Scaffold this active site. Structure first.
Site, PDB file in Angstrom:
ATOM      1  N   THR D   1       1.267  -4.535  -4.846  1.00 54.61           N
ATOM      2  CA  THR D   1       2.733  -4.753  -4.696  1.00 54.61           C
ATOM      3  C   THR D   1       3.368  -5.051  -6.051  1.00 54.61           C
ATOM      4  O   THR D   1       2.794  -5.764  -6.872  1.00 54.61           O
ATOM      5  CB  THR D   1       3.032  -5.914  -3.709  1.00 54.61           C
ATOM      6  OG1 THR D   1       2.669  -5.523  -2.380  1.00 54.61           O
ATOM      7  CG2 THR D   1       4.510  -6.305  -3.722  1.00 54.61           C
ATOM      8  N   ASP D  17       8.399  -1.846  -4.528  1.00 54.03           N
ATOM      9  CA  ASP D  17       7.714  -0.615  -4.161  1.00 54.03           C
ATOM     10  C   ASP D  17       7.534  -0.562  -2.644  1.00 54.03           C
ATOM     11  O   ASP D  17       7.975  -1.454  -1.916  1.00 54.03           O
ATOM     12  CB  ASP D  17       6.377  -0.502  -4.891  1.00 54.03           C
ATOM     13  CG  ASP D  17       5.409  -1.623  -4.541  1.00 54.03           C
ATOM     14  OD1 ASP D  17       5.768  -2.570  -3.811  1.00 54.03           O
ATOM     15  OD2 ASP D  17       4.259  -1.552  -4.990  1.00 54.03           O
ATOM     16  N   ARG D  19       4.279   0.336  -0.954  1.00 48.72           N
ATOM     17  CA  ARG D  19       2.857   0.503  -0.670  1.00 48.72           C
ATOM     18  C   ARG D  19       2.308  -0.793  -0.096  1.00 48.72           C
ATOM     19  O   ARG D  19       2.519  -1.866  -0.669  1.00 48.72           O
ATOM     20  CB  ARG D  19       2.072   0.897  -1.928  1.00 48.72           C
ATOM     21  CG  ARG D  19       0.576   1.136  -1.690  1.00 48.72           C
ATOM     22  CD  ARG D  19      -0.130   1.640  -2.935  1.00 48.72           C
ATOM     23  NE  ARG D  19      -0.101   3.095  -3.035  1.00 48.72           N
ATOM     24  CZ  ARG D  19      -0.676   3.808  -3.998  1.00 48.72           C
ATOM     25  NH1 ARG D  19      -1.353   3.237  -4.985  1.00 48.72           N
ATOM     26  NH2 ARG D  19      -0.572   5.132  -3.969  1.00 48.72           N
ATOM     27  N   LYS D  33       9.788  -3.970   1.838  1.00 51.56           N
ATOM     28  CA  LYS D  33       9.466  -5.286   1.296  1.00 51.56           C
ATOM     29  C   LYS D  33      10.684  -6.144   0.975  1.00 51.56           C
ATOM     30  O   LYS D  33      10.512  -7.336   0.701  1.00 51.56           O
ATOM     31  CB  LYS D  33       8.608  -5.131   0.031  1.00 51.56           C
ATOM     32  CG  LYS D  33       7.206  -4.606   0.317  1.00 51.56           C
ATOM     33  CD  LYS D  33       6.423  -4.302  -0.948  1.00 51.56           C
ATOM     34  CE  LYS D  33       5.350  -3.255  -0.689  1.00 51.56           C
ATOM     35  NZ  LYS D  33       4.407  -3.135  -1.829  1.00 51.56           N
ATOM     36  N   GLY D  47       2.520 -11.875  -1.030  1.00 47.86           N
ATOM     37  CA  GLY D  47       1.396 -12.759  -0.658  1.00 47.86           C
ATOM     38  C   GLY D  47       0.719 -12.284   0.614  1.00 47.86           C
ATOM     39  O   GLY D  47       0.691 -11.057   0.832  1.00 47.86           O
ATOM     40  N   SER D 129       0.964  -7.688  -7.680  1.00 47.04           N
ATOM     41  CA  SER D 129      -0.110  -7.220  -8.550  1.00 47.04           C
ATOM     42  C   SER D 129       0.441  -6.555  -9.804  1.00 47.04           C
ATOM     43  O   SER D 129      -0.102  -6.741 -10.899  1.00 47.04           O
ATOM     44  CB  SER D 129      -1.020  -6.256  -7.789  1.00 47.04           C
ATOM     45  OG  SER D 129      -0.278  -5.191  -7.226  1.00 47.04           O
ATOM     46  N   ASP D 166      -0.036  -0.123 -11.894  1.00 50.62           N
ATOM     47  CA  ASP D 166      -0.808  -0.987 -11.007  1.00 50.62           C
ATOM     48  C   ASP D 166      -1.297  -0.180  -9.811  1.00 50.62           C
ATOM     49  O   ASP D 166      -0.499   0.466  -9.127  1.00 50.62           O
ATOM     50  CB  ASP D 166       0.035  -2.178 -10.540  1.00 50.62           C
ATOM     51  CG  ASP D 166      -0.668  -3.021  -9.499  1.00 50.62           C
ATOM     52  OD1 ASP D 166      -1.743  -3.571  -9.805  1.00 50.62           O
ATOM     53  OD2 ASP D 166      -0.136  -3.142  -8.377  1.00 50.62           O
ATOM     54  N   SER D 169       0.197  -0.784  -6.345  1.00 51.01           N
ATOM     55  CA  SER D 169       1.608  -0.458  -6.196  1.00 51.01           C
ATOM     56  C   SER D 169       1.793   1.050  -6.156  1.00 51.01           C
ATOM     57  O   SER D 169       1.147   1.785  -6.907  1.00 51.01           O
ATOM     58  CB  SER D 169       2.431  -1.044  -7.346  1.00 51.01           C
ATOM     59  OG  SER D 169       2.257  -2.445  -7.446  1.00 51.01           O
TER      60      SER D 169
END
Lengths: 206, 245, 195, 211, 242, 242, 216, 224, 230
Positions: D1, D17, D19, D33, D47, D129, D166, D169
């Site tokens: 994320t 994002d 994912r 999100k 989290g 992340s 990342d 993500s």
């Protein structure tokens, strides 16, 4: 490792004016001993709401009993069928109410949202009620990776009932053939707004 | 025993609420609240409530006060039985502190009055507890920089006002405030005019000359959000400005 | 260590278990009677595991079902009995678990002869045949091989004889003495088989 | 994320994002999100999936209750206090790293809330992340006073950096522009088989039931 | 002293009677009539509505007859709010029995549970009793079709046909004169309409003040119907043909 | 009928039980506190015990203290006042535990007022029958004397009297300003006022029925009871004057 | 983290860094918290623990301030505020707030790991520094207090440079140099330097941008 | 010490509920009208005495986005039940994620109102509620009594001279009318019973888009 | 007064608590008890109630602690409750600390226990009066009452016909301070005899004082003292 004790997997897929849910029929014991081959993991809540519970079998039965209790109380109080989205939110809240002592279950909810227009509805959960809604397919169980691969490769948007049945059955069977602790028969329910087709596939028994 | 408890009489009345309001009226204390454009003022009579004990000459008269702070910015006047009024002050302070801790920002006057009336309704509904014989005015400044003035009674009925009185005279003091406000229709000028109108309203309602020693005046404004009592000298100067035409 | 076996046909159900009472390395008895719990109204709860847990859970379930049947003046259905037993076993699972394995057998007019397999984790399902204990590993395939839907009760007892002989021959615990409950034709019968 | 937030003039811009991952496996390719808390307050979560969803629902409906009772526009600091008190009620558990962005009478306020219950008012922040990848772009390009369009562009660049650098993500870019008057939640902001024959699957039985 | 304000609701009278229970029964007897009967096809409940005004929404509103479970339904006589409380509690008990046993509750057990709740208020504490009497109809496999009659005391009885509320005696007279064992659904519905007409002092029964519902088992599945004014009008004209 | 419970207002907006408590207190033994130039002096006249001859000399003392720098006395029932004084000591203990400094006098007075007031709210609690004086003196702040009434009202005074004959004591004390008179000179005046006011008191029982205490400069601004050597010449001079 | 308090002739100066958390989650933080207009406190240790302690003690201080009111009438970028309570009539004492904080920390010292430095002014004891240690022990410092990871690096340095009756200017210079040296030596402390000067009648809060220059 | 202050009379009546209904019948009148495309709730008050803030004494209140409520009776009881109903709607939304159905809210608040007629040491609520709203099953107007009984209405009035206003609505109301026609009927029904001329200040109207509370200029435009 | 004597939390128009007064009225029907002291000793005496010919006398005095005893007048069950409470407090003080409990603190705790039952409508005042005799640095006599008050006395007596004993004590109080132990016992027995003959069966008699734990006087010594009194 708690999910490996019984094994099991549930899948759901959407088509045009139709939806389908499917599961394996094994009840295992200590990850390797098959003890039943008719343990269906799909449960009818109402005509437009079905739930597929994979994970520990005791928690599957306990959660199904809790959900049946809640749904029956809701429907008798309101004198109407529960909305599939209301049921999904309720399942999230029930799973989160046991956050620190969770039921070891990974549900999916498959049904029709009513608007009369029947929109397919699919969502997948974790053990504490974190839910993700999808337009194409949902998977849970120990066979989740194989099911994800099969559905990613084979899913076709807006299939009719027969094409949806063939695609979901082939996805489930191919995914189950690569999993030790799931299989031993496969149930496939295909819901359309007028009817339901329940089929038992000629599956491997390994 | 329908009139003894807070239960309905045959006419639908709760006579205990009426008798608590009568107890508030019996104290013979007059308090008046006024709202300015960016300020609010409370004036009170600084006399002991009429009760069993009368006024002793050795009683410290500066200690007498019907006006209280709930927070630094919200304040109130409380008229009725003095123990009930002190208990209600402590309840209002506890509610304001709980709001500040739970929500991280200061309560406003309206929410404070509504919480206090929620507490009062339990007395009005539960037979096992006595009604607090205490009427209250609350003043503050809201987040929109406009003054709030609210009033509640033992029945638990909150209402906002441009001006209000807690006292023995109603529908005559209301006429006095109506006349003064329709006559009225810079921040320092607003503060001075509102303080003058509160003092003159109390003087007209009480129908005798006010000594600065025997009245208490408190004010909130955008200039100074803290609820603060003005000095006796300032009140004496304001009283002097009355009758100088 | 407590071998339990169950086999359900169209016209019967049969349960069987070794009759050994174990305390550390010594057999307290070769004629144990703390495994079978016969309930009024064509119902049987065959328990495995620890003897104390077996006694506590078996008597708890028996006294609850009897209380139900006397309070309501009816015989509890076998399905209701099995799911009540599973519910109570799962209730204690996260608070002082009963380390007991269960075969639940019965007869109803509503559903005929019924067998339910249920483990110490309260994972339950209806089965035509089932087994519990380490000896399950040595008997289950025999139950898979020689079972058919139209078995007579005598043929089922022959299958159980094959299971007992295999448990004698191959299992580490050379279990010789067995008790059997035969429910059929509205009668419950007890049998004892040596070797 | 990858989640990010920044404060532009009379506005907050949140971005994320789309994912969600079951470990190495991408479990959802278009997850949302950015969460509604009120008309003038939004938040994003980085989290434990469940804890974030249920905490956001709890915060949203409790804020609606407070708005109904008091009639005032909700404050961001109230949401911060409620979230931090709830998270500290549990000894570090129920982990929720939140970026909370809103506009109230005190202005546009952006807060970073940690899973242990510590809050921090910030001009910009990023979480998840891919937080460091986003923070690189933000720290390079952020300036104190920016237009809404410039803030949207910078949010998009930060989220794209997280998406491409990342592994946790990916997907599309979601954004939400929160002002005092309203919000603009642009979900698809940026986006950087065989059919079997009938009857090929063998079956043992079929049963048709009409509804 | 608060004991001066305590009426002592759970205290015996000199005749071994609970006065509050008898006054609750008096409240029930002044309420509108609810009749129940058993046919071969299934259980019938009927009731006469209380006409407050023409502005009541009569589309899908039923104030006398309520569903407790897919196989249990009930008719109310007395205070409606107490009845709503006890109906919600009965629904909770039915689903609690389904939770605990994975099978539907027998009708007698639900009647016993709700009547135990009613008896508790007469024996325990210092609260007034529930001022409602139920006609609980239902079906189960063990006992077939069933119709029970409850009371504020927690006393219950079992009937093939009975009546409660105002003019219940004349309704019972008509029922014992006309009711018989082997009777069909149409015959039972016509008898229910006749009994409601006789007890309500009307030559012709009006569809606008009749609630009528029935429970019947078919294909091993229980089905409840709550008749609309259209279907009730059809039955009214059929009743007048005879 | 309205005077049978503290939790009921009478039609004219009065709580008669609290008025009866006031009547009870006004008949009880006299207490007074008086601010002086260098201190506060407290005096309790126990005229009711003139009949009981076998009571131990100076055993009965209604003057107590909190933190060794606050005097607390009362007029009313001994047990209720002991309850209030225990609450005062508990409040002081809790305040020092929380904040590591002694409780301010006005905060203690407010808390004890709320504690007294809470028992006038409910139908099942007996309201406290005692008026409570709480007082202190400091070098900078001079004297602060408070009187808490049975209704929860608390009022600040330069001097106060409660109990029997309080009107005559107040009239005699009001004759002159004591804030420019020392406590040692004030003791003679208090003895003269007692001899002129309370008819039961006389020369032969002044020494054993009157409790005295003070907080002044000589006591280092802390609690102390007057020694016999200071009391005896003062009462002798009062008797010779009278 | 570096947090420092120094008593000078006519007040008390508190100072802190701004760095939070090898990765720097935040570089503009507020470790000095306003409890009351005459009372501030510096935090060190776990962040959520200390912040909830600040909220609880703000609630306690507000309650104490409301209860302290008597009835009746009586009598380099800086930001300055004059006390509303000019005579210190009802502002809580610094000792009281510091001691209730010590009580709360000690009661929950099994898991709480927080070290606080209270600084403030009241009319009784004038300017005060109190140090509340990790387990909930309170020590009043009459010269200076220091806490946090960076403070150790400056201990002797502060001990070399403190004077009993410093002026405002030299105390400001000392506390600024102390936080600068601590930031230079400690990785966990950095960013802009916040200073709060508390006096008899006002509080002024300074913000300072910093650089360490040396040719040692 | 807990016993019921509401008890059965010798003739089976609960006199405390009768007296709460008497208090309802004396309080200021309110009404509701359900139209084929909406539902409105209206009420009146005495004219303000030039000092009281009119916006701070609204009787019509919003429960949720498509649910509003008005009352006739005791204001403090109304505030308590209003707070409880907002809490219950929020509880439903936390559970199921959607706005509360009007029927479920009405049933919950009806049970809560009933509980104060049987639980010990309390009196019944001294008010009658009217709850209006919209959901997927359509537009709803529900009355709730002090007893805890609830009624599904098409149009009703619950206060002073409510028999007269109900007769007026019975003559005027039709099953198929527009929102404007219903508002006109509501205003006419209110001004019929009112002593004197009913100004805009003596009217509050709420309409169920989200639940809207009309502004004074809107009411005046309706009063032309 | 029938309106205001119904519940114990009701003040009459004269400001009286009638139920507490009735609890006090319960004390006068008990048998007489007397207590006196000298500089060194406290002597307690009491008349033991005897309800019939075949009965044994009811016990009148009880040991609380090594230097603490009591006598009771009123309802004996209430006295038993208070006796157990006092004994437990004394033994708890001897357990936690290594010293005898302070007599004033014990009497205050008993008086608090008395008062706490006068506050709630669900409680009644203890219908018993205790006289408490002890030696804690000096002889001491305390009295407790149903209303939660307590007092300290140089000489005390109460019960049925205790007025004559009070008159004798009023006459003879000045002698007791300098009396020896034998004369003190004789004076207490004479004060008890004024209330009435006395007998070894029907006369409880105990002493406490300096270097003298609480001791009931033996039947032979009591016979000697009763012979000397006659």
């Amino acid at each position: 490792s708690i999910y490996n004790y019984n094994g099991g997997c549930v899948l759901g897929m959407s088509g045009s004016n139709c939806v389908a849910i499917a599961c394996d029929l094994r009840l295992g014991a200590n990850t390797f001993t098959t003890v039943s081959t008719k343990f269906s993991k799909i449960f009818k809540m109402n005509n437009n709401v079905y739930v597929g519970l994979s994970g520990l079998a005791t928690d599957i039965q306990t959660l199904y009993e809790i959900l049946r209790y809640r749904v029956n109380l809701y429907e008798v109080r309101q004198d109407a069928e529960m909305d599939v989205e209301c049921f999904a939110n309720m399942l999230s809240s029930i799973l989160y109410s046991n956050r620190f002592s969770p039921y070891f279950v990974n549900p999916i909810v498959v049904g029709f949202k009513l608007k009369v227009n029947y929109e397919p509805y699919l969502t997948a959960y974790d053990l504490i009620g974190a839910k993700c809604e999808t337009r194409d397919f949902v998977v849970n169980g120990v066979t989740s990776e194989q099911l994800f691969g099969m559905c990613e490769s084979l899913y076709v948007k807006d299939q009719d009932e027969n094409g949806l049945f063939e695609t979901i059955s082939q996805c489930l069977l191919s995914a189950l053939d690569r999993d030790c602790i799931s299989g031993w028969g496969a149930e496939v329910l295909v819901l359309t707004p007028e009817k339901i087709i329940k089929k038992k596939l000629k599956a491997r028994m390994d | 025993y329908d009139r003894h408890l807070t239960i309905f009489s045959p006419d639908g009345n709760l006579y205990q609420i009426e008798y608590a309001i009568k107890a508030v009226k019996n104290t013979n204390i007059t308090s008046v609240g006024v709202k300015g454009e960016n300020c609010a003022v409370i004036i009170s009579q600084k006399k002991m409530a009429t009760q069993y004990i009368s006024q002793d000459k050795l009683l410290d008269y500066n200690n007498i006060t019907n006006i209280y702070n709930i927070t630094d910015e919200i304040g109130c006047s409380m008229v009725g039985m003095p123990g009930d009024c002190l208990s209600m002050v402590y309840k209002a302070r506890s509610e304001a502190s709980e709001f500040l801790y739970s929500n991280g920002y200061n309560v406003n006057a309206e929410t404070l009055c509504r919480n206090i009336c929620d507490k009062i309704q339990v007395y009005t509904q539960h037979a096992y507890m006595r009604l607090h014989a205490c009427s209250g005015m609350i003043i503050g400044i809201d987040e929109n920089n406009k003054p709030e003035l609210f009033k509640f009674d033992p029945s638990g009925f909150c209402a906002g006002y441009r001006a209000c009185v807690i006292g023995n005279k109603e529908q005559e003091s209301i006429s006095v405030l109506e006349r003064l406000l329709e006559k009225r229709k810079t921040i320092d000028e607003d503060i001075r005019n509102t303080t003058i109108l509160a003092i003159e309203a109390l003087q007209t309602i009480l129908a005798f000359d006010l000594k600065a020693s025997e009245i208490e005046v408190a004010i909130v404004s955008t200039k100074n959000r803290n609820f603060t009592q003005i000095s006796e000298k300032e009140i004496d100067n304001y009283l002097t400005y009355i009758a100088e035409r | 260590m407590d071998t339990l076996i169950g086999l359900r046909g169209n016209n019967f159900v049969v349960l069987a278990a070794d009759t050994y009472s174990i305390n550390s390395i010594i057999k307290l008895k070769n004629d144990d009677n703390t495994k079978f719990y016969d309930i009024h109204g064509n119902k049987c709860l065959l328990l495995g595991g620890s003897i104390g847990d077996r006694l506590q859970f078996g008597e708890f379930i028996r006294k609850n079902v009897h209380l139900y049947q006397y309070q309501n003046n009816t015989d509890m259905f076998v399905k209701s009995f099995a799911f009540f037993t599973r519910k109570n076993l799962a209730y204690y699972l996260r608070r002082n678990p009963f380390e007991v394995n269960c075969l639940i057998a019965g007869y109803d007019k509503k559903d005929g002869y019924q067998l339910y397999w249920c483990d110490y984790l309260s994972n339950m399902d209806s089965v035509n045949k089932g087994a519990h204990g380490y000896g399950a590993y040595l008997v289950s395939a025999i139950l898979d091989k020689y079972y058919h839907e139209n078995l007579t009760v005598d043929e089922a007892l022959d299958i159980f004889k094959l299971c007992f002989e295999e448990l004698k021959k191959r299992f580490l615990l050379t279990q010789i003495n067995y008790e059997l409950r035969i429910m059929y034709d509205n009668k419950v019968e007890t049998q004892y088989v040596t070797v | 994320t990858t989640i990010c937030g920044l404060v532009c003039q009379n506005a907050v811009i949140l971005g994320a994002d789309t994912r969600a991952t079951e470990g190495p496996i991408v479990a959802d390719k278009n997850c949302s999100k950015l969460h509604y808390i009120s008309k003038n307050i939004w938040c994003a979560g980085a989290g434990v999936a469940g804890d974030l969803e249920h905490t956001t629902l709890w915060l949203q409906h409790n804020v609606e209750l407070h708005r109904l009772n008091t009639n005032t526009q909700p404050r961001v600091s109230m949401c911060v206090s409620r979230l931090t008190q709830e998270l500290f009620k549990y000894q570090g558990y129920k982990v929720c790293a939140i970026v909370l962005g809103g506009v109230d009478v005190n202005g546009p306020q952006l807060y970073g809330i940690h899973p242990h219950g510590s809050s921090c008012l910030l001009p910009f922040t990023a979480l998840g992340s891919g937080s460091l990848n986003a923070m690189a772009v933000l720290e390079a390009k952020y300036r104190d006073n920016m237009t809404i369009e410039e803030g949207k562009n910078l949010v998009c660049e930060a989220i794209c950096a997280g998406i491409f650098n990342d592994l946790g993500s990916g997907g599309n870019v979601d954004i939400c522009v929160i002002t005092k008057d309203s919000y603009q939640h642009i979900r698809p902001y940026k986006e950087p088989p065989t059919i079997y024959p009938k009857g090929t699957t063998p079956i043992l039985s079929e049963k048709i039931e009409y509804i | 002293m608060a004991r001066r304000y305590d009426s002592r609701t759970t205290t015996f009278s000199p005749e071994g009677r609970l006065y509050q229970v008898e006054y609750a029964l008096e409240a029930i007897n002044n309420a509108s009539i609810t009749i129940g009967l058993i046919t071969k096809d299934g259980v019938i409940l009927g009731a006469d509505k209380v006409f407050i005004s023409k502005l009541i929404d009569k589309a899908n509103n039923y104030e006398k007859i309520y569903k407790i479970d897919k196989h249990i339904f009930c008719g109310v006589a007395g205070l409606n709010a107490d009845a709503n409380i006890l109906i919600n509690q009965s629904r909770l008990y039915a689903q609690r029995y389904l939770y605990n046993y994975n099978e539907v509750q027998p009708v007698s057990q639900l009647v016993v549970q709700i009547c135990d709740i009613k008896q508790s208020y007469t024996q325990y504490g210092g609260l007034r009793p529930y001022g409602v009497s139920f006609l609980i109809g239902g079906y189960d496999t063990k006992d077939g079709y069933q119709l029970y009659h409850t009371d504020p005391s927690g006393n219950y009885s079992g009937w093939f046909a009975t009546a409660i509320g105002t003019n219940n005696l004349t309704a019972s007279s008509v029922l014992k004169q006309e009711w018989k064992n082997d009777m069909t659904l149409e015959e039972g519905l016509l008898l229910a309409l006749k009994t409601l007409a006789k007890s309500t002092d009307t030559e012709i029964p009006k569809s606008e003040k009749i609630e009528l519902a029935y429970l019947t088992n078919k294909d091993g599945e229980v089905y409840q119907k709550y008749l609309t004014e259209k279907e009730i009008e059809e039955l009214i004209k059929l009743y007048t043909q005879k | 009928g309205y005077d049978l419970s503290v939790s009921t207002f009478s039609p004219d907006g009065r709580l008669y039980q609290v008025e009866y408590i006031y009547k009870s207190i006004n008949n009880n033994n006299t207490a007074l506190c008086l601010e002086c130039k260098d201190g506060i002096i407290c005096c309790c006249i126990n005229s009711n015990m003139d009949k009981n001859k076998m009571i131990k000399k100076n055993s009965y003392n209604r003057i107590y203290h909190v933190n060794n720098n606050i005097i607390i006395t009362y007029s009313g029932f001994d047990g209720d006042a002991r309850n209030i004084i225990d609450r005062a000591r508990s409040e002081a203990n809790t305040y020092y535990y929380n904040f590591h400094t002694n409780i301010p006098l006005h905060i203690l007075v407010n808390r004890i007022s709320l504690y007294i007031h809470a028992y006038t709210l409910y139908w099942h609690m007996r309201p406290f029958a005692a008026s409570i004086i709480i007082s202190s003196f400091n070098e900078k702040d001079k004297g602060d004397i408070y009187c808490i009434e049975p209704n929860g009202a608390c009022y600040k005074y330069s001097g106060i009297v409660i109990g029997k004959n309080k009107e005559m004591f107040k009239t005699e004390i009001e004759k002159k300003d004591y804030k420019d008179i020392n406590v040692r000179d004030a003791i003679e005046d208090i003895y003269k006022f007692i001899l002129t006011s309370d008819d039961h008191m006389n020369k032969n029982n002044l020494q054993n029925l009157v409790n005295f205490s003070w907080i002044c400069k000589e006591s280092s601004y802390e609690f102390q009871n007057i020694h016999e050597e200071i009391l005896t010449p003062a009462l002798n001079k009062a008797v010779e004057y009278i | 983290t570096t947090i420092i308090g120094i008593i000078y002739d006519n007040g008390v100066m508190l100072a802190c860094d701004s760095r939070t958390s090898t990765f720097i989650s935040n570089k503009c933080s507020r470790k000095i918290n306003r409890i009351n207009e005459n009372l501030y406190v510096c935090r060190s240790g776990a962040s959520a623990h200390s912040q909830k302690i600040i909220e609880i003690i703000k609630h306690y201080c507000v309650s104490m301030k409301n209860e302290n009111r008597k009835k009746g009438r009586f009598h380099v970028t800086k930001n300055k505020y004059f006390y509303e309570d000019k005579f210190n009539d009802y502002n809580p004492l610094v000792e009281n707030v510091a001691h209730i904080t010590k009580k709360i920390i000690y009661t929950n010292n099994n898991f709480l790991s927080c070290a606080l430095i209270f600084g403030g002014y009241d009319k009784i004891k004038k300017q005060q520094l109190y140090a509340v240690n990790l387990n909930g022990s309170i020590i009043e410092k009459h010269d200076f207090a220091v806490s946090g990871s960076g403070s150790i690096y400056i201990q002797s340095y502060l001990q070399d440079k403190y004077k009993k009756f410093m002026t405002k200017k030299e105390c400001f210079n000392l506390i600024l140099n102390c936080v600068k040296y601590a930031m230079h030596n400690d990785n966990s402390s950095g960013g802009l330097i916040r200073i709060v000067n508390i006096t008899k009648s006002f509080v002024e809060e300074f913000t300072v941008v910093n650089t360490q220059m040396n040719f040692q | 010490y807990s016993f019921s202050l509401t008890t059965f009379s010798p003739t089976g009546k609960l006199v405390q509920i009768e007296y709460a209904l008497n208090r309802v019948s004396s309080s200021s009148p309110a009404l509701g009208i359900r139209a084929k495309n909406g539902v409105i709730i209206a009420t009146e008050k005495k004219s303000p005495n030039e000092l009281i803030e009119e916006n701070s004494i609204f009787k019509i209140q919003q429960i949720s986005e498509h649910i509003g409520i008005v009352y006739a009776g005791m204001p403090g009881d109304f505030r308590v039940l209003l707070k409880r109903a907002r809490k219950e709607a929020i509880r439903y939304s936390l559970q199921y994620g959607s706005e509360i159905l009007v029927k479920e809210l009405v049933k919950i608040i009806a049970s809560i109102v009933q509980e104060f007629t049987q639980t010990g040491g309390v009196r019944p609520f001294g008010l009658s509620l009217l709850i209006c709203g919209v959901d997927v099953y359509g537009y709803h107007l529900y009355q709730i009594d002090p007893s805890g009984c609830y009624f599904n209405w098409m149009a009703t009035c619950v206060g002073k001279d409510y028999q007269n206003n109900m007769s007026f609505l019975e003559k005027r109301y039709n099953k198929d009318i527009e929102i404007e026609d219903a508002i006109h009927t509501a205003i006419l029904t209110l001004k019929e019973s009112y002593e004197g001329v009913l100004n805009e200040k003596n009217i509050e109207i709420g309409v169920a888009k989200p639940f809207k509370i009309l502004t004074q200029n809107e009411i005046k435009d309706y009063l032309i | 007064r029938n309106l205001y004597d119904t519940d114990n939390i009701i003040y009459s128009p004269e400001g009286r608590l009638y139920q507490v007064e009735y609890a006090s009225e319960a004390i006068k029907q008990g048998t007489c008890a007397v207590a006196i002291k000298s500089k060194d000793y406290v002597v307690v005496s009491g008349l033991k109630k005897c309800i019939s010919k075949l009965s044994f006398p009811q016990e009148k005095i009880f040991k609380i602690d090594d230097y603490i005893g009591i006598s009771m007048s009123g309802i004996t069950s209430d006295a038993k409750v208070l006796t157990k409470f006092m004994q437990n407090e004394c033994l708890s003080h001897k357990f936690l600390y290594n010293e005898n409990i302070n007599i004033e603190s014990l009497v205050r705790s008993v008086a608090d226990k008395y008062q706490k039952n006068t506050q709630k409508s669900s409680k009644r005042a203890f219908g018993v009066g205790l006289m408490i005799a002890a030696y804690h640095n000096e002889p001491c006599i305390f009295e407790t009452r149903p209303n939660g008050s307590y007092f300290e006395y140089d000489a005390l007596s109460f019960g049925a016909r205790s007025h004559a004993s009070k008159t004798y004590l009023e006459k003879n109080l000045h002698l007791f301070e300098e009396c020896s132990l034998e004369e003190l016992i004789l004076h207490c027995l004479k004060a008890l005899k004024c209330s009435l003959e006395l007998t070894i069966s029907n006369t409880a008699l105990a002493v406490v004082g300096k270097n003298h734990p609480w001791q009931e006087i033996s039947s032979l010594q009591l016979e000697e003292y009763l012979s000397k009194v006659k």
